[PDB]
Symmetry: C3
């Protein structure tokens, strides 16, 4: 028999579980990309239609706040995790496992998957996330930091551009909205996303939140 | 331990040699990504060297007047009926094959592949009349890197025989090899001849298997 | 029959063994990073406190000799009776050890290695007479050089430096390179600068390459 994705019998990943157990529906399973001992398995969502292994961020969100003050009114990319007070870089997999173990489990998926993708949602109050309505351009768009020392941007090297799935942040309305970003690649080493650098921030009324989506490997 | 049959695949040919030194060179089933046995691939194992050799699909580019019109032209990216070379059991989904290859490419000590260019009135490497390799074809590897007659010596191919040096109205062939300790660079996925586009100028290609150690 | 680190039942690596048998103490174990066939397992030292997998050099040491007679000079490449350092069971073929090491890197977030330079009238790191490091030795990594200065990503750190002065006596300097990019290890060669007068001599203890 071939492991069925339970904690006692984790599969290698969700693709293997799909291949060997095509009866199983999308949901929560345990996978062990590094094989060997079963005890360091990680808990994931398996999309059984696509075969994707999806690992949630912990924590899932960055609360909505006035995170950055720069009263010189200068606008500049500022990394949330690297530079902001209360800042953290994004983390993935079972919080009860050692960080080193999670890093290796992710490394197996990042290095040896055919592709990967991840969405991230920026919650905005008076903060352009991508397009600025006044200008019609994306010069004020935020950046994302990948996992292979690379950045995902609105423009530039086309191998490194994200795409925007919706964009409700184009004007300062004094209200809350959101923009959803996605990076999709055949070089899964570049994922997951570990940081975000908003540009249109620093003013007294400028605020943001973040919902970090699961990194999904095929 | 695994015997290399379809129902019991070995991780790769090197393991199969190690664990069964009595087995002889031939067709076996290997499963580099391990885990579930069902996505195993069919390969040739050289049991003298331990190499895992995966055949291209399809095996070859048939001989013809492929191109009309001097510069490198990618067969797969730019020619009519052009296609890139792929590898592994065609009944398996492409993402699954990518993964099986990735395991071999990332984690082998070395890899090699031969390509044979069949030529009629087409220089492949050396031009006998000029005495240079400026008209030499190019190859496409798997990390978007090119293999060439010259340049960075980490990305140059070698030539094992060269019968394509003159236009003679007859058919001949030149055999190219890329060999590397950085196996992510292989397999070869496209070829760009240079000395083509004339009426009389025809070519074919035999794509050798990518062999991992 | 959960893998136990014996030759017949090797674990994948030291952390894997620690995870499956956390009562086990540090010492020598058989691990098999590439899995599949158990017969190409490698004998390693498992630090069971940290979970590190440590592979010894073979040979362990360069003996104390007047190695060079009158530039940085590579021990393995240029010196009479010199050799590059190698890792893993010598009775396993090189291509197989290469594979085991490739897997060990994948199973690792980070790696480290120490190397001890035994010196007589041979500056290793700091030169007392000049207050500077210009004469400091260099190490050859896998894939890449480790140096006293230059790019930060590639600088080693020094743990003791007793080689600062020509004293006529034997002393030693301890080097360490640590990185997330485990492809850069292990160390394969060593390049001392301050050699060799008739007086000048050295030896080396290559410490295990350690993966976590
Ligand atoms: Ca495991
Ligand atoms: Ca498999
Ligand atoms: Ca093995």
């Amino acid at each position: 028999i071939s492991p069925d994705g339970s904690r006692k019998n984790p599969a290698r990943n969700c693709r293997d579980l799909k291949f060997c157990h095509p009866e199983l529906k999308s949901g929560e399973y345990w996978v062990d990309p590094n094989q060997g001992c079963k005890l360091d398995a990680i808990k994931v969502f398996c999309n059984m239609e696509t075969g994707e292994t999806c690992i949630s961020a912990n924590p899932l969100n960055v609360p909505r706040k006035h995170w950055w003050t720069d009263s010189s009114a200068e606008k500049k990319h500022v990394w949330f995790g690297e530079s902001m007070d209360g800042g953290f870089q994004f983390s993935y997999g079972n919080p009860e496992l050692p960080e080193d173990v999670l890093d290796v489990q992710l490394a197996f998926l990042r290095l040896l998957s055919s592709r990967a993708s991840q969405q991230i949602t920026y919650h905005c109050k008076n903060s352009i996330a991508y397009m600025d309505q006044a200008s019609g351009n994306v010069k004020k768009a935020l950046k994302l930091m990948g996992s292979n020392e690379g950045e995902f941007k609105a423009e530039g090297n086309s191998k490194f551009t994200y795409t925007v799935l919706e964009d409700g942040c184009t004007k300062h309305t004094g209200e809350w909205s959101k923009t959803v970003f996605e990076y999709r690649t055949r070089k899964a080493v570049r994922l997951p996303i570990v940081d975000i650098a908003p540009y249109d921030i620093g003013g007294p009324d400028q605020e943001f939140g973040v919902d970090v989506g699961p990194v999904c490997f095929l």
